[PDB]
Structure formats: C-alpha cells, structure tokens
C-alpha cells in the first residue's frame, strides 16, 4: 500500500501524504559552514525515481582540523554520532 517511503525527505505516500520539513539545517549538507536554505521542494515525480534530513541508519561525517601542540591535523567527525554507534 505504501507507494513511496523516501527517507531522504521523509516523504511517505500510503495512497496519506506525509512530509516533515525540519527547519534547522544548513544549505549544504557536506559541511555546516553554508547558508541556511529555508526553501523546500518536494517534486513527487522526481522523488519517485540534495537531501535535507538525516536517515536513522545513515551516519554522515565531515573532516575538520585540530591544533593542540604541534601542527593542524585533519580528523573525521560524525554529525550524528548517536546514530553511528547520558
């Protein structure tokens, strides 16, 4: 019965049409250092073939620099460590 259950945009169409549109998220998902894209588009045709949310099973990541005593070093950090693994 559930025609489409895209978790990228949380669009579920039971044939009901449910779409959650979280406001807090940066334009670019690759890094947080990007404008805040408030616009949201939900093309049903395209969706039935640039994500906004994050899947529960998906654990994104981005590389960031760190400097303590020596030289700047790049280390990976997960945007949702709870999903990855008080």
């Amino acid at each position: 019965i559930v025609l489409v259950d895209n978790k990228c945009k949380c669009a579920r169409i039971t044939s009901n049409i449910r779409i959650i549109v979280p406001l807090n998220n940066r334009e670019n998902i690759s890094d947080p250092t990007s404008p805040l894209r408030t616009r949201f588009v939900y093309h049903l045709s395209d969706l039935c073939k640039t994500c906004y949310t994050y899947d529960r099973n998906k654990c994104y990541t981005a590389v960031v620099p760190l400097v303590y005593g020596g030289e700047t070093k790049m280390v990976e950090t997960a945007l949702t460590p709870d999903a990855c693994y008080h």
């Binding site: 779409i19 959650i20 549109v21």
Partner: protein, 235 residues
C-alpha cells in the same frame, strides 16, 4: 512467381517467445494431388536447413505432399539469415523457388507505454468492465502483448489485440491496441491486473505495466505537511 502461388508463413515473434521454435512453413495451393510434390528449404548461400519436423498430415484439398519447415534456432532470424523454399512437381516444367529475408528493422524506438484506467461512464452501467493496454511510440513492428493476472496468461478468447498501424507523427513509429473484457466487480478489486508487452527494440523484450483506481485520479488528498520546527532526522 506468376503461376501456381506458393504460401510462405514465417514464425512470428509470439512463437519465438512462447513456443520457442522458428519454423518457416511454405506450401503450394491450387495444384494437383499427385506425387513428386517435394517441399525443401535451403539458404540462398547454398547451405541447407534442419529436417522438416512436425509435418502436416492432413491437407485442405488432400494434396499428397509434405510441407517444408526447419526447427532452426532463433539465431537465424536477426538480419542476415535468409531462406529459400523449393517446390517441385511433375505438372510444372521446373521447380519453383521462393526466397525470404528479414525486414531489417530500422530507426529503433524504445516502446513508450501509457496505460489509463477504464472510462468513468462504464462504471455507471455496472454491467461489465473493459481494460486497455494501448501501446505507442515503438519501432519496428511485431510487438506482442498479453494480459496477466498473478502469473496467469489469459486466453485469447478473453482478451483481444489489434495489429499496429502507422502513427501520425511519422512513418517510423507504429501503435497498437489490446483490450480485455472482465466483470465490473473484478476491476473494482484490481486483482493484480498486468499487461506484458514484448518487443525486439526493448533491452529485454519484456515490459510489464499495471493500473488501479489509485493510479488514475484519487479525488481525496489527505495531505499532512508536518512543519516540525526541529527534527533534523526523520521525526
């Protein structure tokens, strides 16, 4: 050929797909029934063909002869595998030869199927329903169609199909139709109705389509756009 016509009915794509046997049948009509009526097959190059299997015992006019055929594999059907039916009889002074080749289909076009549910008006009659599987935007010809219901190839007595006619956009495109009658209630439930279309231009020569009340036009729209100021993930 001018005197004494010779029929030649090659194997259609349906038998290649379902029966899986390319048999080239050739016969002679309006001829005498004596002996010496030998029907043989050979390639124009000179090579012969397999034995004529599954001959026809009875004849329309009890013509004492043996139809010529060959159980060749599908490889002898692509573009460059021609054939020749030779017939000999005492009445004629010399044997008659009939050469046949492939149409060499050109301007291949991926079939574009656009199905749509039965018309609303039928529902008011409430006596019977009919479904269409019109196909268009395809080339070359020789497109097969069938109506499946949960892997149940429906008999030709249930569904009918038409030959393809030239499309108005251009002559390098054809279109065909295939209807199937059922009861209105059966259509109401959907019953996993599907249409299977086989065409050489298709990458796999098999394409399935289906339709239901939902597919056509749902009047209701229980749209629920949850704003969810802050979810981040799937809330």
């Amino acid at each position: 050929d001018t005197a004494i016509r010779v029929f030649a009915i090659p194997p259609s794509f349906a038998s290649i797909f379902l029966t899986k046997s390319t048999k080239l049948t050739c016969l002679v009509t309006d001829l005498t029934t004596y002996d010496s009526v030998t029907i043989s097959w050979t390639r124009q190059n000179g090579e012969a063909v397999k034995t004529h299997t599954n001959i026809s015992e009875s004849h329309p006019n009890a013509t004492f002869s043996a139809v010529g055929e060959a159980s060749i594999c599908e490889d002898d059907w692509n573009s460059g595998e021609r054939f020749t039916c030779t017939v000999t009889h005492t009445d004629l002074p010399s044997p008659l030869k009939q050469t046949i080749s492939r149409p060499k289909g050109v301007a291949l076009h991926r079939p574009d199927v656009y199905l749509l549910p039965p018309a609303r008006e039928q529902l008011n009659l409430r006596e019977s329903a009919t479904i269409t599987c019109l196909v268009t935007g395809f080339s070359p010809a020789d497109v097969f169609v069938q109506w499946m219901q949960r892997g149940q190839p429906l008999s030709p007595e249930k569904y009918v199909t038409s030959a393809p006619m030239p499309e108005p956009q251009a002559p390098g495109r054809y279109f065909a139709h295939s209807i199937l009658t059922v009861s209105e209630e059966e259509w109401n439930t959907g019953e996993t109705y599907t249409c299977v279309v086989a065409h050489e231009a298709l990458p796999n020569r098999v394409t399935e389509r289906t339709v239901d009340k939902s597919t056509g036009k749902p009047t209701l729209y229980n749209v629920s756009l949850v704003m969810s100021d802050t979810a981040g993930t799937c809330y």
